[PDB]
Design a protein around this nucleic acid. Structure first.
Ligand SMILES: [Mg+2]
Length: 832
RNA sequence: CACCCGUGCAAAAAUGCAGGGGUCUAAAACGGAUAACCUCUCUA
RNA sequence: CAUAGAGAGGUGAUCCGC
């Protein structure tokens, strides 16, 4: 990024008439380095400072870094932000000018600093990412109905954790038509075989059998409420719902526990098997502590390598000491290939239980050493020490680890008491907080890449929150949250939970015994419509991790009709590297890369086998190419949709803050553009914005983004072209993924696909055409639809018309309306 | 290759130069390798 | 007929290499 980070400036904070500077501690920890009053400074961290101040000025501070490869950098004084070249110093606002309201929301008072708002914006990013993956999860559940109804039924949208199943079953005989249809919708859902795609959530190994209705309902109700709370903005106490999950009724806690216990128990039991003999031998050779603490330590050192602190090749030291001894030979058969690794733990305990002075002297020598020659000499002396002082006990290991003794000990266990054993490995539900269990439930419906992105984003944002909460203690600032957000005072615990979650969370497998139902989908995803070949194709499809995504987020024969779109196929296989195109074509065919792409783009469209040796590998080559192409396409469209889900989430959230700040924002459900009009200070009359542009409006625009006349005038001009109904149906298309559901109709006629932005917006614009074709449409929307039929490509004007709700955040509006600005990975020229 | 802020130098209207931005955008830093187990297909 | 004797393909836990 920047020289300030390279110099080690982790942050610069303002606190009244004082400025504080920080550097990177261990991990994401911050340490205080300097304070500036005015043109004058005082050092901190005096025993290991990361950088020094070369000269301090009111414009900015110059620094030189000791912490690494030395660089010289300059950093700008936060108090002169917005105050250079025309009261000359002030604590900066956020761009939205919501800082006083956000501070008065999460904490009780306005704070006169800019440390609190960074924490708050991390809280807002946690909700931002949950709105995305909860929307994806509910879409994945709703897709199960797509073979029976095209509509996104309300059954998932209305659910709340207020109604327990015992007052919902009362609807079975209720007289009210909607409540009856709601229960018959639940009965229709629980009978669908496609629950087998989510076996880890809905099935219990007890063959594995479908759970009792009360738990299926409680799962659906939890995920539905999580979506409703993320995508809408709640009123009253429901706003605090995610932060008051301790208040959930017993059925939801019990279902969360019984879902979370099945991965934990499995992994907490595998380790008690693959290790029995090793743990017993260690528990005999060592007697120095309660054996549960030995087992804890062995688990900890096996699963966490501690290289973030013990950052040196202890394994090289081991080899340097054991080389040339029988310990490096077939002295006994048991460990010539594997099973050797407790020797490392013997070394590790030889560092933890004693000679920690030598370990600290080693860590110092490793900091002071210059050459690999030095580290090698030190390793040789450590080998000379350890091989005489402590290693002799491994001879008793060599006595204990004989093969028949291994076989005997395999019939035995460590005899830790059950309630102690269950507290020396991965914690069970009883200990894990409801938030992490609900995150695990959400992850049950997601792809592995989505699980990784979600969990690591949560880890990062909680670690940031923790770091700021630590900073505020040393600075002596008021840290105490409002009572309703006191959840975040446990954030250091939740980070420890989330990093534990990342240690075992994994993609939802299918039921192994269920595959004979997926067979029909596995054939209908290709369009194959003697039996051994068909069974082989089915088995080589159902095992594919790409099929497991593609059939959960899409209807298979709808994917097969989508694969007839030669332009989109040709585009997505243009982005496959040429060497991969060779690796496919050499396997599928038995000469330019363009003509080979074109040929396999026709092969993948006419793909079939039949009417309902290496040949098998040829068949795999055809299958693996096909599923890969569609996987890349649909994933990226879903990833484009998430960006607009965030945008509408923000529209909902910031409206309530702008309303809370005193702006007459109006009804955001009647017209999503009301906030932008409110921020622009313009008001509709008779359905038209009458006002022309004037500088006096921009100079009074309610946020910093809209202060500039150029983009204010452009947003006003595009907003006069918007239409209420089209923006609302765009919003619902985004929140329901209807554009991706109806992909075989929206994609029917495209000339060319330039990028996934153009494809996604063609899908939306053709959906809006299909929704408004039978309705009265006003002038500019009719022109946009005309240009959408004259050119079989998305209208660049229409997207910047219907995206006008986001205009209040100019950076978001630009990013979501100009391609090449859209994707971090594919930069390009902006227009206008 | 977006937005915003600082500074130097042009300039009276906006350009250039070099930086900063957890308080901006999703957007601060932060190859196979053997063995073991299930599943499918093909002979006798 | 089913289960059995070699192949052969694939998914998911993984021990080291310049
Ligand atoms: Mg941010």
């Amino acid at each position: 990024k920047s020289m300030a980070k390279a110099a080690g400036v982790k942050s610069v904070f303002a606190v009244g008439n004082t400025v504080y500077m920080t550097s990177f501690g261990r991990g994401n920890d911050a340490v205080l380095e300097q304070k500036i009053v005015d043109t004058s400074h005082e050092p901190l961290n005096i025993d290991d400072p990361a950088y020094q101040l070369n000269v301090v000025t009111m414009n900015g501070y110059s620094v030189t870094g000791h912490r690494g490869e030395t660089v010289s950098a300059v950093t700008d004084n936060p108090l002169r932000r917005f105050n250079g070249r025309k009261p000359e110093q002030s604590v900066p606002t956020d761009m939205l000018c919501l800082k006083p309201t956000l501070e008065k929301k999460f904490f009780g008072k306005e704070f006169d600093d800019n440390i609190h708002i960074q924490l708050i914006y991390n809280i807002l990013d946690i909700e931002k990412i949950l709105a995305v993956y909860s929307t994806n999860a509910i879409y994945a559940l709703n897709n199960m109905s797509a073979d029976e109804n095209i509509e996104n039924s309300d059954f998932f949208m209305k659910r709340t954790t207020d109604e327990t199943f015992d007052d919902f079953e009362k609807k079975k005989e209720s007289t009210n038509s909607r409540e009856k249809a709601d229960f018959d919708a639940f009965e229709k859902f629980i009978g669908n075989y496609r629950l087998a795609y989510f076996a880890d959530a809905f099935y219990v190994n007890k063959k594995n059998v479908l759970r009792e209705d009360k738990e299926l309902y409680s799962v659906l109700t939890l995920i539905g409420k999580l979506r409703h709370w993320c995508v809408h903005s709640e009123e009253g106490r429901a706003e605090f719902w995610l932060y008051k999950l301790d208040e959930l009724k017993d059925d939801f806690k019990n279902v969360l526990d019984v879902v979370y216990n099945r991965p934990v128990e499995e992994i907490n039991n595998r380790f008690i098997e693959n290790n029995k003999v090793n743990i017993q031998i260690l528990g005999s050779v060592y007697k120095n502590t309660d054996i549960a603490e030995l087992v804890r330590s062995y688990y900890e050192f096996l699963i966490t390598k501690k290289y973030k602190n013990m950052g040196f090749s202890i394994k090289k030291l081991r080899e340097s000491m054991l080389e040339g001894k029988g310990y490096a030979d077939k002295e006994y058969d048991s460990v010539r290939n594997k099973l050797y690794q407790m020797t490392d733990f013997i070394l590790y305990t030889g560092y933890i239980n004693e000679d920690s002075d030598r370990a600290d002297d080693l860590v110092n020598t490793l900091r002071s050493s210059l050459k690999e020659d030095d580290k090698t000499t030190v390793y040789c002396k450590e080998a000379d020490y350890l091989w005489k002082k402590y290693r002799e006990s491994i001879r008793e290991v060599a006595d204990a680890l004989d093969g028949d003794n291994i076989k005997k000990l395999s019939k035995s266990n460590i005899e830790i008491q059950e309630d102690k054993l269950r507290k020396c490995f991965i914690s069970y539900a009883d200990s894990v907080s409801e938030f992490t269990k609900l995150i695990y439930l959400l992850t049950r419906f997601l792809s592995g890449k989505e699980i990784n992105d979600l969990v690591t984003t949560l880890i990062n944002k909680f670690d940031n929150i923790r770091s700021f909460l630590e900073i505020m203690d040393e600075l002596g600032l008021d840290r105490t949250f409002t009572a309703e957000y006191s959840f975040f005072e446990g954030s250091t615990k939740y980070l420890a939970e989330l990093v534990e979650l990342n240690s075992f969370v994994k993609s939802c497998s299918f039921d192994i015994n269920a595959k004979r139902t997926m067979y029909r989908d596995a054939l209908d995803i290709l369009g194959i419509e003697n039996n051994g070949l068909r069974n082989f194709i089915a088995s080589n499809v159902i095992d594919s991790n790409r099929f497991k995504y593609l059939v959960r987020y899409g209807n298979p024969k709808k994917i097969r009709e989508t694969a007839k779109c030669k332009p989109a196929v040709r585009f997505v296989l243009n982005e496959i590297p040429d060497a991969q195109i060779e690796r496919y074509y050499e396997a599928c065919c038995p000469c330019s890369a363009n003509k080979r792409r074109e040929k396999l783009a026709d092969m993948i469209a006419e793909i079939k086998f039949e009417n309902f040796a290496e040949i098998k590998r040829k068949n795999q080559a055809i299958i693996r190419l096909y599923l890969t192409v569609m996987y890349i396409m649909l994933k990226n469209l879903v990833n484009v949709n998430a960006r607009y889900v965030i945008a509408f989430h923000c529209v909902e959230r910031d409206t309530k803050l702008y309303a809370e700040s005193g702006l007459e924002v109006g009804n955001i459900e009647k017209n999503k553009t009301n906030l932008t009009m409110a921020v622009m200070g313009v008001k509709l009359e008779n359905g038209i914005i009458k006002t022309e542009f004037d500088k006096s409006f921009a100079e009074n625009a309610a946020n910093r983004y809209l202060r500039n006349a150029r983009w204010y005038k452009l947003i006003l001009d595009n907003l006069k072209k918007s239409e209420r109904a089209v923006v609302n149906e765009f919003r619902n298309t985004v929140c329901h993924l209807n554009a991706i559901r109806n992909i075989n109709i929206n994609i029917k006629e495209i000339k060319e696909v330039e990028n996934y932005f153009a494809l996604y917006h063609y899908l939306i614009q053709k959906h809006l055409e299909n929704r408004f074709a039978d309705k009265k449409v006003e002038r500019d929307t009719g022109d946009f639809i005309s240009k959408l039929e004259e050119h079989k490509t998305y209208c660049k004007d229409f997207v910047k018309a219907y995206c006008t709700p986001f205009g209040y955040n100019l950076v978001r509006y630009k990013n979501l309306t100009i391609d090449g600005l859209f994707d971090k990975n594919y930069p390009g020229k902006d227009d206008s």
